[PDB]
Amino acid sequence: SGFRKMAFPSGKVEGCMVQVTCGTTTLNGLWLDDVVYCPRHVICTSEDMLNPNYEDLLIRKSNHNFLVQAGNVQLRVIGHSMQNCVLKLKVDTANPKTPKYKFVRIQPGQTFSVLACYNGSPSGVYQCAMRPNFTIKGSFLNGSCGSVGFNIDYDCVSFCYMHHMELPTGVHAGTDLEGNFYGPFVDRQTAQAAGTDTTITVNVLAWLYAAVINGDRWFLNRFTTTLNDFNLVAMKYNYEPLTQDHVDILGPLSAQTGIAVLDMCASLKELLQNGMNGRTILGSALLEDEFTPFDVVRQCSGVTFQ
Amino acid sequence: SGFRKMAFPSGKVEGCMVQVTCGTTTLNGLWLDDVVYCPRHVICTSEDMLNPNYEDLLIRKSNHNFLVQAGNVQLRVIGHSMQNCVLKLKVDTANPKTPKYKFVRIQPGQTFSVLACYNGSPSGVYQCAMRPNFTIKGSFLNGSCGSVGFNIDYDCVSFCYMHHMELPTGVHAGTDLEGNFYGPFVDRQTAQAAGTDTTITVNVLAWLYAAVINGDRWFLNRFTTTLNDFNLVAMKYNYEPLTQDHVDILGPLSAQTGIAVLDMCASLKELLQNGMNGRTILGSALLEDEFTPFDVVRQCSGVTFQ
Ligand SMILES: *C[C@H]1CCc2ccccc2C1=O
Numbered sequence: 299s300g301f302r303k304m305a306f307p308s309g310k311v312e313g314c315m316v317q318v319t320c321g322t323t324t325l326n327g328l329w330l331d332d333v334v335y336c337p338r339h340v341i342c343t344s345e346d347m348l349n350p351n352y353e354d355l356l357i358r359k360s361n362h363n364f365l366v367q368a369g370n371v372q373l374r375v376i377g378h379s380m381q382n383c384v385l386k387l388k389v390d391t392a393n394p395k396t397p398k399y400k401f402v403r404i405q406p407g408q409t410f411s412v413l414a415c416y417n418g419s420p421s422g423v424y425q426c427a428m429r430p431n432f433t434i435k436g437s438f439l440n441g442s443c444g445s446v447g448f449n450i451d452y453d454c455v456s457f458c459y460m461h462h463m464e465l466p467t468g469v470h471a472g473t474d475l476e477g478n479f480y481g482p483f484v485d486r487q488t489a490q491a492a493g494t495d496t497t498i499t500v501n502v503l504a505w506l507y508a509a510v511i512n513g514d515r516w517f518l519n520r521f522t523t524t525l526n527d528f529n530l531v532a533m534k535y536n537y538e539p540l541t542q543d544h545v546d547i548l549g550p551l552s553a554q555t556g557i558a559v560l561d562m563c564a565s566l567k568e569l570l571q572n573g574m575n576g577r578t579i580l581g582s583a584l585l586e587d588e589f590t591p592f593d594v595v596r597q598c599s600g601v602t603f604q
Numbered sequence: 605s606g607f608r609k610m611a612f613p614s615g616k617v618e619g620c621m622v623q624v625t626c627g628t629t630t631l632n633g634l635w636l637d638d639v640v641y642c643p644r645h646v647i648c649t650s651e652d653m654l655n656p657n658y659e660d661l662l663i664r665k666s667n668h669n670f671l672v673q674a675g676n677v678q679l680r681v682i683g684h685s686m687q688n689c690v691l692k693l694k695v696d697t698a699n700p701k702t703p704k705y706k707f708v709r710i711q712p713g714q715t716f717s718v719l720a721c722y723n724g725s726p727s728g729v730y731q732c733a734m735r736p737n738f739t740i741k742g743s744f745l746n747g748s749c750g751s752v753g754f755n756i757d758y759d760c761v762s763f764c765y766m767h768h769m770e771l772p773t774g775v776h777a778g779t780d781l782e783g784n785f786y787g788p789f790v791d792r793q794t795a796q797a798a799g800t801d802t803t804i805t806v807n808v809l810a811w812l813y814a815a816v817i818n819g820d821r822w823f824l825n826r827f828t829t830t831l832n833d834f835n836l837v838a839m840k841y842n843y844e845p846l847t848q849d850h851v852d853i854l855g856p857l858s859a860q861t862g863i864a865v866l867d868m869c870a871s872l873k874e875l876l877q878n879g880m881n882g883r884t885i886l887g888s889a890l891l892e893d894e895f896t897p898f899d900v901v902r903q904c905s906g907v908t909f910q
Pocket residue numbers: 438439440441442443444461462463464605
């Protein structure tokens with residue numbers, strides 16, 4: 299029993315992290331097969347970041363301008379191209395530690411593990427969620443760019459995020475591994491504000507199920523509700539609207555606990571209207587929304603990755 | 605910026621995790637050099653756990669009764685001995701992935717990363733603290749025994765915990781890597797209740813400093829206090845007594861922020877007497893106490909491990 303914010307084991311991704319240096323900046327790259335992926339703003343001076351023309355800045359860059367180092371051995375760059383907001387550096391050595399992997403573009407509400415790195419060396423691992431406003435609430439310092447987010451299923455690493463920017467409000471923006479930003483953000487130091495940070499309703503419900511599974515049940519009331527009536531309350535509290543698709547995804551957790559999804563919605567309703575009155579749920583004094591239904595089943599069943 | 609509950613990269617420890625099976629149970633072992641460490645209750649049936657005589661149970665066990673498997677290749681057990689509550693299985697192959705490592709017995713209040721494993725295969729990683737009552741608030745299911753807690757400094761893994769038991773209240777107990785339990789717990793299915801779960805005052809203060817560093821400052825008041833007067837409030841709320849040693853350890857964070865430790869204590873005082881009035885600090889609605897001062901500096905500076 300017990301419920302913790304749990305990341306995937308980091309080993310498979312650690313073996314892919316390299317250091318990339320272009321004249322000015324040093325950030326992280328991802329070495330898979332014989333290609334290194336990194337944010338394209340490695341070619342920029344902090345002065346350039348105010349309004350860079352990446353195509354023009356790239357004209358003055360050749361293969362040998364990109365210094366790539368795995369641990370303490372240099373890698374030889376034999377080609378380079380820009381794809382959207384990432385650079386793909388072709389090297390002459392395939393990464394011998396390349397795991398089975400896929401590139402995935404995740405949807406808002408989905409969670410993943412971030413391996414924060416500096417100078418191509420891992421510093422720590424933690425769990426995040428793609429916020430509905432397409433930001434992530436990470437922990438990133440200067441030089442952390444190029445760190446990646448991932449999920450592990452079976453023996454396959456699903457890379458879904460590369461870290462690019464920190465907005466003035468302290469939240470984080472980035473791309474998929476094809477270089478397309480999540481949300482409307484751009485790799486430019488400008489005014490780009492985040493939208494409403496709405497709560498991921500389905501994840502809250504999943505976490506409430508995890509609480510019931512792990513002993514915490516004081517919030518179970520005698521009420522039920524309907525999707526339409528619950529959503530009237532959700533809207534007021536800036537919660538994602540709950541759909542039938544969300545209900546169906548919660549089916550397995552509803553079956554395990556014997557609590558109908560709409561009964562759990564009525565408990566959430568009371569929590570939003572009445573607060574938690576100084577009580578706690580799974581060690582938290584607020585409603586947690588960065589656990590997916592899959593995350594809850596995974597941690598409460600003990601799924602393995604090999 | 606941003607502050608997250610961050611574990612160490614798990615790769616170095618993943619390479620040490622093996623599966624150990626003794627007739628009945630399968631749990632995890634730690635393969636370092638040519639020795640596999642695992643909980644001694646692997647030799648027990650769930651029936652034995654009510655009152656086992658481990659010495660007598662071990663007499664009927666020979667090297668070949670211990671099946672050790674790294675991934676899908678068997679390891680050959682050439683010797684076995686019991687040290688306190690762990691078994692040391694001598695194998696004929698040194699682990700080629702053995703990191704630089706130490707065994708450390710940590711003190712209450714110290715934090716570490718746990719790599720939860722099942723059948724010798726890693727499932728996830730999360731951060732914990734040794735509670736003042738010598739429990740840990742982990743996430744463990746059946747078969748997770750033998751999972752380990754560790755800290756990484758530089759290139760050296762400091763192993764400090766091996767998971768052994770789940771108490772009836774849902775908290776977790778275990779040993780150092782020399783097999784000595786933390787606190788008064790024993791590897792027996794009996795009545796052993798946990799003491800008061802006191803709050804780690806120094807860690808709360810460290811986290812308040814992390815909040816100031818990362819933008820959250822509403823809780824900074826105009827007051828100060830003294831150690832003796834603050835501790836009168838701490839005692840009332842079941843907080844660890846703060847000592848001069850704790851003050852000194854907070855010196856670096858006090859210097860970085862320009863907030864004297866005793867001024868921060870006065871802010872904590874008001875938080876304990878008046879609550880947070882629905883506000884939040886670093887995304888939490890309660891006072892977090894599983895970040896050490898070292899943890900805060902590490903995450904706010906970007907320390908590297910190679
Ligand atoms: C990716 C980097 C860019 C620079 C930076 C400065 C301060 C805090 C975070 C960051 C990043 O995320």
